[PDB]
Amino acid sequence: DNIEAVGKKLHEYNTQFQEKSREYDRLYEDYTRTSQEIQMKRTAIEAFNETIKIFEEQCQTQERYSKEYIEKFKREGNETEIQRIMHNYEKLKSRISEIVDSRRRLEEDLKKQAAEYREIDKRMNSIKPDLIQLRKTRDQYLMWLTQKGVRQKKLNEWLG
Amino acid sequence: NQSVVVDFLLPTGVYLNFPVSRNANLSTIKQLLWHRAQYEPLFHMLSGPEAYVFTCINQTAEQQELEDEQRRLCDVQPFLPVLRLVAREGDRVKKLINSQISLLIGKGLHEFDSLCDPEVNDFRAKMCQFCEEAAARRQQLGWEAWLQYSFPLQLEPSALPNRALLVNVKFEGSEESFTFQVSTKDVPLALMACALRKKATVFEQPEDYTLQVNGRHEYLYGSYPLCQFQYICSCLHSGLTPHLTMVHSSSILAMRDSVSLWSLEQPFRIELIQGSKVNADERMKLVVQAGLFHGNEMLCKTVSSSEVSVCSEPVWKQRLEFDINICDLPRMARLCFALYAVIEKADCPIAWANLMLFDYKDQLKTGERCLYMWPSVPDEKGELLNPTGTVRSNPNTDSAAALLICLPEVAPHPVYYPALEKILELGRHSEEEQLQLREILERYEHEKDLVWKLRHEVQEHFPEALARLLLVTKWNKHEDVAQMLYLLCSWPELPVLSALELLDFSFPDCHVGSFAIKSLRKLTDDELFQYLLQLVQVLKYESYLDCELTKFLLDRALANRKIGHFLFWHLRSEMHVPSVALRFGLILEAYCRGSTHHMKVLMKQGEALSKLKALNDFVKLSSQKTPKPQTKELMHLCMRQEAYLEALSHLQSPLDPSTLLAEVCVEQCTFMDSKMKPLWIMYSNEEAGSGGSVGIIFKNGDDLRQDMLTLQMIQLMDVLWKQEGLDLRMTPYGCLPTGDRTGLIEVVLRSDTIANIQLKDALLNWLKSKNPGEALDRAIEEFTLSCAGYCVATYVLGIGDRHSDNIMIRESGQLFHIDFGHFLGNINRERVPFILTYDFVHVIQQGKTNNSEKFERFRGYCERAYTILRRHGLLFLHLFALMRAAGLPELSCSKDIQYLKDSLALGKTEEEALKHFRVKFNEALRESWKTK
Numbered sequence A: 001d002n003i004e005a006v007g008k009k010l011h012e013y014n015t016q017f018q019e020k021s022r023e024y025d026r027l028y029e030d031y032t033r034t035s036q037e038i039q040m041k042r043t044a045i046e047a048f049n050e051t052i053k054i055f056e057e058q059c060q061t062q063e064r065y066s067k068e069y070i071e072k073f074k075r076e077g078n079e080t081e082i083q084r085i086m087h088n089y090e091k092l093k094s095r096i097s098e099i100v101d102s103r104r105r106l107e108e109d110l111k112k113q114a115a116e117y118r119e120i121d122k123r124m125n126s127i128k129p130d131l132i133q134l135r136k137t138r139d140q141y142l143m144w145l146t147q148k149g150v151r152q153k154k155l156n157e158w159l160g
Numbered sequence B: 001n002q003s004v005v006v007d008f009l010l011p012t013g014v015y016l017n018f019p020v021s022r023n024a025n026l027s028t029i030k031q032l033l034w035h036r037a038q039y040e041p042l043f044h045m046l047s048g049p050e051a052y053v054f055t056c057i058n059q060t061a062e063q064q065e066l067e068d069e070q071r072r073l074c075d076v077q078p079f080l081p082v083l084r085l086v087a088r089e090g091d092r093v094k095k096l097i098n099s100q101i102s103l104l105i106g107k108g109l110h111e112f113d114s115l116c117d118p119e120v121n122d123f124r125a126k127m128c129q130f131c132e133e134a135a136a137r138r139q140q141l142g143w144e145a146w147l148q149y150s151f152p153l154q155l156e157p158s159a160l161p162n163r164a165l166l167v168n169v170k171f172e173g174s175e176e177s178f179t180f181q182v183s184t185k186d187v188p189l190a191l192m193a194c195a196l197r198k199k200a201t202v203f204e205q206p207e208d209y210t211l212q213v214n215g216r217h218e219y220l221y222g223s224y225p226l227c228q229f230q231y232i233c234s235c236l237h238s239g240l241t242p243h244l245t246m247v248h249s250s251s252i253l254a255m256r257d258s259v260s261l262w263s264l265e266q267p268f269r270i271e272l273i274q275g276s277k278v279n280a281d282e283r284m285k286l287v288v289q290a291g292l293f294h295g296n297e298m299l300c301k302t303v304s305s306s307e308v309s310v311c312s313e314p315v316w317k318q319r320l321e322f323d324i325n326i327c328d329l330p331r332m333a334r335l336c337f338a339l340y341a342v343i344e345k346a347d348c349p350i351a352w353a354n355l356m357l358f359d360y361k362d363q364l365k366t367g368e369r370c371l372y373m374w375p376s377v378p379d380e381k382g383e384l385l386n387p388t389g390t391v392r393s394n395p396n397t398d399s400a401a402a403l404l405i406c407l408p409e410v411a412p413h414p415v416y417y418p419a420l421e422k423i424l425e426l427g428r429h430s431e432e433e434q435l436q437l438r439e440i441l442e443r444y445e446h447e448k449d450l451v452w453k454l455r456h457e458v459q460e461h462f463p464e465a466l467a468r469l470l471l472v473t474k475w476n477k478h479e480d481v482a483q484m485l486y487l488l489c490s491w492p493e494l495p496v497l498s499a500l501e502l503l504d505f506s507f508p509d510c511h512v513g514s515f516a517i518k519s520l521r522k523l524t525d526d527e528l529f530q531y532l533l534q535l536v537q538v539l540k541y542e543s544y545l546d547c548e549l550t551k552f553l554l555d556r557a558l559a560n561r562k563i564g565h566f567l568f569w570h571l572r573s574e575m576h577v578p579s580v581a582l583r584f585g586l587i588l589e590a591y592c593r594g595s596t597h598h599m600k601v602l603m604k605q606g607e608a609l610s611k612l613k614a615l616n617d618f619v620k621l622s623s624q625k626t627p628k629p630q631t632k633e634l635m636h637l638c639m640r641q642e643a644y645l646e647a648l649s650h651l652q653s654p655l656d657p658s659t660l661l662a663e664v665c666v667e668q669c670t671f672m673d674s675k676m677k678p679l680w681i682m683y684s685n686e687e688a689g690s691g692g693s694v695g696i697i698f699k700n701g702d703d704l705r706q707d708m709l710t711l712q713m714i715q716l717m718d719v720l721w722k723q724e725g726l727d728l729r730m731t732p733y734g735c736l737p738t739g740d741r742t743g744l745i746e747v748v749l750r751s752d753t754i755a756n757i758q759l760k761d762a763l764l765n766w767l768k769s770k771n772p773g774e775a776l777d778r779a780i781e782e783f784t785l786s787c788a789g790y791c792v793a794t795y796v797l798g799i800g801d802r803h804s805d806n807i808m809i810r811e812s813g814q815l816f817h818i819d820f821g822h823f824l825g826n827i828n829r830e831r832v833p834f835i836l837t838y839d840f841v842h843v844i845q846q847g848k849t850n851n852s853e854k855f856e857r858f859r860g861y862c863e864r865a866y867t868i869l870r871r872h873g874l875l876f877l878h879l880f881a882l883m884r885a886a887g888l889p890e891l892s893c894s895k896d897i898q899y900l901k902d903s904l905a906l907g908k909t910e911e912e913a914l915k916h917f918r919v920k921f922n923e924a925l926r927e928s929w930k931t932k
């Protein structure tokens, strides 16, 4: 109504707009940070898949390469040679299980962080209307006091 | 831990798991592998070590055959410590390059394949062929052409006094050298001849030689005088004797080795099927606003969907008809979406997404499309839609929100936007008003229609007003689009300045951009370099991957190595930004393929940069716990490790690839224990000379683009002043963003800050202690010239934030400004006045009360400096316009550009502008006393 009471409100509303602007900009840092981490997790999973895939080619090779070679000393001479090969093969298969378990764990974290990404965005989209409505309110009061003829010096002291 | 257990997959199927040292090279790991394999089955069937190559899955998720076996396992950095032996044979050169590219450009090349996209695959086919061919053609040319490619001439602007001074020349692989005198106006051929005469004392031709500035990749050649070279210019000013070396041409060779669109008069429409992964307030309701665009302006009114209840998976299923026909849609018509959350009836921008209607092959898009939206950010403008926003999809397809839409079948056959021949067909057939045209053009809905009617006259008599005539054209009617495109074909070539304007987002048409590039081909490499940053940011405005601007930048990158270097880093330092990761990724790949020499330079820089990040993180982890002296000691103990020392040693500087960073001086390295904690890394070079020491600051935590932009603009002014014969002794030191909030800054040696030097007349006495006797007159003249330059530069650019600890002074006398964080008045802003400081004014006058003779010369330098910038005011406006692409908070709108219009006073005349500048100057001279 009066210039002091409106200017006093312009100060309170600007402070509230500055605090809400910080909260959004803080949450937006987390949206970007989380966005980069999920893409890193996604490439790491592709890295696991590619590694696992290389181990499965090794099994294919192990079986194909054993089959032909094994028959030459299959009960002809030394079956000690057979036991070393198959024990070595169980050692390969046993390693795959670990790598799979490590892929499994990264899938679980990516799921949990996908949820996090999503809750940041939801909290961002709740603040936006208040941030915007505090931007317009702040601006209307500035426009009102400028029309009333309030000098720029007096507006500055209210704005922060 | 030192060791690490590595899995070894042998080609017999056999598996070995033993520990090796992280510091062991792959050649050492083969030896150890073979030693262990001998005691495992099937060993007799393995060929020799040298028959095989290790394979690993690198950090970017691709198989990489590890051909260079002098690399350490920690430098290879496999995803899991797993190595597979495989046959050497194949196309080993293609496989090696593809892997090196993926590691250098940040993104794995498989991710481009993963997309399943014709536009990507076609881009990669066309450009990689072009770049490979250009690199092949480069090899077949002579050593001279290659020398021009690799080490292009670094000249002083204007590209007078003829005094004599000595010069040292020698030959490669020889300790002794022949000193002799030559003049400044001598061509470089004449200098070599005297050395070859001095060679032939007891005992070839000069044209089979060039002169190398030793300790540097910087060569003196061509039909320019000795004075126009930056080295001799920097030598003759300083007084140091210019050292050179005579390189043989063979030694340079060593380095080198029917359905129509217009028939369809049916209104435009789309089906809006579904949302996806939408995170909004459940009490509110979702709405989707849609609008067609061509640049900034709308083609028709903006329609809307109904209010569905807020959920993750909202389902609309609506036709959204528009006030425009299918025939009326221009080539660059841009459908733009925004999903809004609104309260219960009787506004929250959630996300936004844009889609070109026609595809890259010119075909109108038909059928279902899934637009993964970008999240909207609250800004001052408060616009509904984001038509200037990127056209590519959000790369986070995993968790980002989506809008499912379906553009219906307009016809049984696929319809395309017509070819140029049919565009010119429609465009062909179609004292009093000249006075009003002059007034409007040489200075609104009335005015725009007059510009349209007299468009032939605009072409005939006002060729530079093309941008004005483009924006008055109605791009929502195909008859009007044809007529304007018809004139564009026969439109006369515009100057570089006018072409720069046309590269802005306001002119999205392909023919306009093509015309724009057509006019930028007259750019010399030197002047292109001044605008390279601006041109790269304009790529973010392009609709399609293959564009005339992309071809242009690659052409120039492949023809000049210096330009390609900086093209690479500009693009490389934005690969963390999802918006441009794909686009920039594809350009970097094409560059590399035509630039395999410089890949080896860029590879070395990247691993230097990767070690420093790690080294700065350790210093950040250590500085919180321990004090500085111990952390400084612990920095050196890390640096002296083979992996670090070899990586940081012997590389070309990213800031200037002609500078050779040879041996890191670990004792002289340090860091500042405040803020982002920037590393100070010092190098030496015994081959160089008095400027043999060079420095780099590695900072990680700030975004260095605005500091680069500001530094670049001061460099532009320094060139613009020099061209009119005014040298104001500036220090536009180098600043290069290399990554996500990461970059290098060039150290200016022999300099402290005013704040530290002031710790009565402290600056005058400091300059005395660095310039005693007859030297003091140089230092004051160096101070006065530079102070004037940086007074005007900071005034014009609107630079706030200045203070005693972000202005530095040189031991030569030169004053210079650092660490630019704010500009254009800026977050609210006010006009920065012109600022004289008493302490500087005290030094300018040689420490006297009243020295009117000197102070008037300083007044004149400012007036002349300011007057020269006004002559090129539009260049700054145009260059700044295009930087709005960069998304800098302080350079994001028309009012941020208006600041430069006012500060240079472009709206006033030349006499009236200088009268206002005088009033601002004098008021500054008065205000320097007042306030304590």
Ligand SMILES: C[C@@H](c1oc(=O)c2ccccc2c1C1=CCN(C)CC1)n1nc(-c2cc(O)cc(F)c2)c2c(N)ncnc21
Residues within 6 Å of the ligand: B670, B671, B672, B678, B679, B680, B697, B699, B707, B733, B735, B745, B746, B747, B748, B749, B751, B752, B753, B818, B819, B820
């Ligand atoms: C303030 C000084 C400085 O900056 C550090 O970060 C630093 C770090 C570890 C040790 C010393 C330092 C110093 C010095 C302190 C006192 N010394 C006697 C002189 C050097 N400084 N800062 C920039 C500088 C300029 C930019 O545009 C951006 C940026 F990020 C830094 C700069 C430069 N380009 N050339 C020379 N000196 C420079």
Ligand SMILES: [Cl-]
Residues within 6 Å of the ligand: B079
């Ligand atoms: Cl891991």
